[PDB]
Amino acid sequence: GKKKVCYYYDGDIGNYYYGQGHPMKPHRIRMTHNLLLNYGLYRKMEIYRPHKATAEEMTKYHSDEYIKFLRSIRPDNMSEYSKQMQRFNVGEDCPVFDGLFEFCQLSTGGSVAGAVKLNRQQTDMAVNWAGGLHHAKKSEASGFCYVNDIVLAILELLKYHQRVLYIDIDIHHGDGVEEAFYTTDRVMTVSFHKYGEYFPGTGDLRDIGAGKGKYYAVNFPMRDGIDDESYGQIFKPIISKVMEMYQPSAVVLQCGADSLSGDRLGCFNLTVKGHAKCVEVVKTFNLPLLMLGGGGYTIRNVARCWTYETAVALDCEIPNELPYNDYFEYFGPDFKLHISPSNMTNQNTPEYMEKIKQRLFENLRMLP
Ligand SMILES: CN(C)C(=O)[C@H]([NH3+])Cc1ccc(F)cc1
Ligand SMILES: [Ca+2]
Ligand code: NA
Ligand SMILES: [Zn+2]
Description:
GO terms for molecular function: chromatin binding; enzyme binding; heat shock protein binding; histone binding; histone deacetylase activity; histone deacetylase activity, hydrolytic mechanism; histone deacetylase binding; histone decrotonylase activity. There is one protein chain. The protein contains 11 helices and 8 strands. 49% of the residues are buried. The chain has one domain (1-368). Helix content is 35%, strand content 11%. It is an alpha/beta fold. The radius of gyration is 19 Å and the shape is globular. An 8-stranded parallel β-sheet has the order 2-1-3-8-7-4-5-6, sandwiched between helices. Bound molecules: the ligand CN(C)C(=O)[C@H]([NH3+])Cc1ccc(F)cc1, calcium ion, sodium ion and zinc ion (ZN). Residues 24, 132-135, 143-145, 170, 172, 199, 256, 258, 265, 294-295 line the site of the ligand CN(C)C(=O)[C@H]([NH3+])Cc1ccc(F)cc1.
């Protein structure tokens, strides 16, 4: 049936600024929100403003030293922290900006608040588009991510769920999440991603986990230009098998939109419908589901993607004609919700997709 959806958003999020030229634009979350408000989707779901997660909350995963650094560092005291900045991988990809810590607190607060909601059985789905920062590590920033909201949310779910399944359709590998849970069977991580001279450089299919977590990390490496049909060929089958073999009681789905056609940093060729089919698939298992954001650098298409995927969560059909909104000019020249793929070559042959799939299936036969 139709699911109750709780959605997390702080309108201050759009005002954080990574700096001139930096492709990460928090503003995209405000565009997303404004677009789905203008489609009327607030009528169908509960909207919450998340708390700011505390340093205490964050050190459920991150080191005390790293979190102490994140809450002290500012543009005005950077010169005095040059050593700490290098150690914690801050100051370049992951710059120091005004309100950095508060940005992390809001990002993280959405993900944990959604997980609490799900644990209390007061929603079927929770949505935090400001979350999904899958590259942050225990004691270091990486790939524009500082605090790993996903890891903290899963730790919250593990309080009431013996097995949690994490699925990642961001074009990048979910390295920080895989790393955190690599040696436990209580979290299975499934990542689909570009692989081959590409950030972060991990997610080989031969990376399957270790110790009690061996066979609970699943990696589908892809080449440039995958399209809706190649992706669709393998996502439903892999997820069905994972569900069947792993039998999770809760699911976290990272929905990074840098896997869309025309993403400024991405090299895939998915449409918003192709992307969103993944949400559709996971929804059908009828499990407590936390949906998070992620990467995405062509921001009009990020707003489309996460608006449509909100509508998917709600089983609420919306028209292709975009309603008027505060960012209307960004959606030219067509002013429609859905996007076309490019004519870029798909380097992923059908044979390649089926072969990688069959290798993952052999691995999944190793579960209890
Ligand atoms: C470019 N790059 C590393 C990426 O896009 C990754 N997906 C990491 C990431 C960035 C922003 C975000 F909001 C969530 C995750
Ligand atoms: Ca991924
Ligand atoms: Na694991
Ligand atoms: Zn990404």
